[PDB]
């Protein structure tokens, strides 16, 4: 079998955490939602 | 278990929904048709969900 189940799995779960922190950083700090 | 194949241009008695068809003619006689139907059903089911 050819697959990644030990490389991308501890990586893709971290990508989403970074993305959610950035989306949070926009709203609750720079107040785009108030614009 | 994964709906994956690496076989190109040879037979293995199987070719969202579809993408598998039953090569009924090539099938080994000493392995019955009945289990191969279940195998085709399982591979399609895993590819679907």
């Amino acid at each position: 079998v050819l697959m990644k189940r030990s490389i991308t799995a501890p990586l893709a779960a971290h990508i989403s955490l970074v993305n959610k922190a950035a989306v949070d950083y926009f709203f609750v700090e720079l107040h785009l939602e108030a614009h | 278990l994964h709906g994956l194949l690496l076989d190109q241009h040879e037979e293995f008695f199987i070719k969202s929904l579809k993408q598998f068809s039953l090569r009924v003619e090539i099938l080994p006689s000493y392995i019955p048709v009945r289990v191969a139907e279940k195998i085709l059903f399982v591979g399609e089911s895993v590819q679907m969900f």
């Binding site: 050819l2 490389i7 990586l11 990508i15 970074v18 993305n19 950035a22 | 690496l6």
Partner: protein, 81 residues
């Protein structure tokens, strides 16, 4: 692609061991750009490369993850600005 092209050979575990060390640098590349946002440029052999300011040039392994990393790095790169 020589791996997916193969399924069984006397050189199949040999090629697994060869690719397993031939992918050792690239995993380190990706382990740089996600946690730092700055990859040490070699010759531009990194597959991704580089006011609103975003005009990065981007447009094989799974490209399903390539654009994911391409957005995962440019956002940290904005925080550096």
């Amino acid at each position: 692609q020589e791996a997916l092209h193969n399924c069984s050979n006397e050189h199949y575990p040999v090629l697994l061991s060869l690719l397993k060390t031939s992918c050792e640098p690239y995993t380190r590349f990706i382990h740089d750009w996600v946690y730092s946002g700055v990859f040490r440029d070699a010759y531009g052999e990194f597959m991704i490369q580089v006011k609103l300011y975003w005009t990065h040039g981007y447009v094989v392994f799974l490209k399903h993850i390539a654009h994911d990393i391409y957005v995962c790095g440019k956002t940290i790169n904005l925080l550096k600005l």
